[PDB]
Write a protein that binds this DNA or RNA. Sequence first.
RNA 1: ACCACGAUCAAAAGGGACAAGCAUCAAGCACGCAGCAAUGCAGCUCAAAACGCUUAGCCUAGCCACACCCCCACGGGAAACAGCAGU
RNA 2: CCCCACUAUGCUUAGCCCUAAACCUCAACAGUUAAAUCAACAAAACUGCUCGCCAGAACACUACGAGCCACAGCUUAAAACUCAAA
Lengths: 171, 39, 58, 71, 51, 110
Amino acid sequence: DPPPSTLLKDYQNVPGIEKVDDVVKRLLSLEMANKKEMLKIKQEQFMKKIVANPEDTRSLEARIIALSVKIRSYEEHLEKHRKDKAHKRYLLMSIDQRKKMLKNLRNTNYDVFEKICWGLGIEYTFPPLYYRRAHRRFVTKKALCIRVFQETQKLKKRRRALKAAAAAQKQ
Amino acid sequence: ATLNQMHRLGPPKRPPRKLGPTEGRPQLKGVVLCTFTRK
Amino acid sequence: NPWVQIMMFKNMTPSPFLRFYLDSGEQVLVDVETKSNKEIMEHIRKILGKNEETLREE
Amino acid sequence: KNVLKIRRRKMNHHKYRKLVKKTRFLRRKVQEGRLRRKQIKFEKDLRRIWLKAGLKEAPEGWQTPKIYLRG
Amino acid sequence: ELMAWNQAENRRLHELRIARLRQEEREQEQRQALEQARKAEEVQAWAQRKE
Amino acid sequence: VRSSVHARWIVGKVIGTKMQKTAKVRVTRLVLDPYLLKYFNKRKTYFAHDALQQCTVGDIVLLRALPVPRAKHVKHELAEIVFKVGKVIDPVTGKPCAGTTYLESPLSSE
RNA sequence: ACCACGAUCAAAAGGGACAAGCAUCAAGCACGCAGCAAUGCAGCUCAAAACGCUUAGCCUAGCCACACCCCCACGGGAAACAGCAGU
RNA sequence: CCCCACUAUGCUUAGCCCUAAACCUCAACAGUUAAAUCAACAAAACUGCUCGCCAGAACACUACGAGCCACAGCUUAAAACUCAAA
Ligand SMILES: [K+]
Ligand SMILES: [K+]
Ligand SMILES: [Mg+2]
Ligand SMILES: [Mg+2]
Ligand SMILES: [Mg+2]
Ligand SMILES: [Mg+2]
Ligand SMILES: [Mg+2]
Ligand SMILES: [Mg+2]
Ligand SMILES: [Mg+2]
Ligand SMILES: [Mg+2]
Ligand SMILES: [Mg+2]
Ligand SMILES: [Mg+2]
Ligand SMILES: [Mg+2]
Ligand SMILES: [Mg+2]
Ligand SMILES: [Mg+2]
Ligand SMILES: [Mg+2]
Ligand SMILES: [Mg+2]
Ligand SMILES: [Mg+2]
Ligand SMILES: [Mg+2]
């Protein structure tokens, strides 16, 4: 998070803000503001770090950054409010809308899609093809079918050596 | 339904016609077991 | 042309165009921006369509 | 509208709940037997797999779990 | 001959595209000039209010 | 020029790259619904040989039939990447684009 | 007739296409790929219906399948009209 | 049904259960008020597009199968016999 001494986004570019009394600097810093003011500073840092034009807020890049800051705020909220079903819904929906943005950014501008993922620390994942309940009977059979495959592979290799050994003896 | 829905469902699957007491046959041979009257 | 694959792509480029792939390996790009649908049909008929004589014989 | 369709369903549901209450001990014995057959049918399904793959016994260290018991 | 005629029709459409794009840049610049002026006034006003 | 493979030239979208030197390509064709007389997309999967492993999931590729299949399901090879995913070059102008917008103006090189 | 680097006809093999009902058949369980090989990778099919069950000769200048049964027919059960007439 | 007393329960914490006439029984998005306004009633009549759902009554918020922390449960959900109606 930005330091508490950080000035608000509105007062950072006023002339003479560095020569005012320390008390005035405390009153115009993040320490004396609500968390939403800290999130505006985080959004500004990500913009300059990632997007080519930090002033264009309507580009697909800026929206992914704006939404990514909201997602981190919900995650921090839900860390303290674990039974808040309203904000848990907002988190899951926001994650689903960022994936829809990242998909559309990957399809249109891959070089920018790569910078957005590196800058925000997002690991893009392709959706699974089939969403279906892995119930007990399925999770047990699939495990057995993988074990049976693994054992058949081992037996097939022990049928390569014995055949190889016998062939050498003939010579 | 929408055209996409009609295409996805396909033509309506008409249930196979049921067979009555004769099992789809015009007549059947039978052996009488008992006679009686019904109201 | 039931055996000719036709595939559509939306909003992938700034302008609309047709591209034909021929058996030889040749590719025919047809720019259609500003053209009416009737002009597009007449254009591809001229460059890649069978003439009326070839069809009469068949 | 009248509630005549609801009333038919009302009585059907009432009589069903009462029947289940009257026979809840027989139904519990039947349910237990079905779960046993269900478990056996599941074990056979897995045994068919390794047998059709050429193995003679279950994969080393494999124990088929009981996936239908309340525990 | 038809493949060459098609390439020539595309080149013709390209010159019309370049002419159309030049007229759109001049219009974009005019608008972009006003928005910067307006946006500069809003900043100076917003900056004065904050100062 | 002869080949035993039915589909000689097909365009499709790469939907899988998990096989070595093989791209899984979804090819869609228009098929007429006889009752509705409306065309609906019908998709089929083709494995295409990709020697250089240059195909990315989501890019449009052109497949060429091989003279004879090289594997049970590999009957085609990658002939050309038509539209690289997120890196499309406009064929009409030759300039890079991001959707319906140019990334470099056609007026740059006149 | 023979040779036909041909035509006609048409197997095997390779590619594609090709019935109906049931989704209370929803997962299949090795179903993939690369490599000269060694071997390596862990993949392949599927709610756009895989897998499964049931039903049915079919798209009729005709075609397919079967030819007592064990899909096959070395072998075995056994001793054969689903050729015509006939019982 | 009326009167009195009192418990589970209504509360909190931690986990389950996943059902309502959960109905404003009127789906989402976009659009219209002109033509034929329009079965009746209700909350005037419609267009575009899309998804979901429906196809006589009853059997049946049932049986069986399957899934589920559910074990007198929930969801999904038939058929036979019967009727000329509902
Ligand atoms: K036979
Ligand atoms: K209501
Ligand atoms: Mg009333
Ligand atoms: Mg009743
Ligand atoms: Mg053949
Ligand atoms: Mg059932
Ligand atoms: Mg039959
Ligand atoms: Mg016989
Ligand atoms: Mg035989
Ligand atoms: Mg005879
Ligand atoms: Mg109490
Ligand atoms: Mg209270
Ligand atoms: Mg309510
Ligand atoms: Mg409702
Ligand atoms: Mg909806
Ligand atoms: Mg009914
Ligand atoms: Mg109920
Ligand atoms: Mg029930
Ligand atoms: Mg049950």
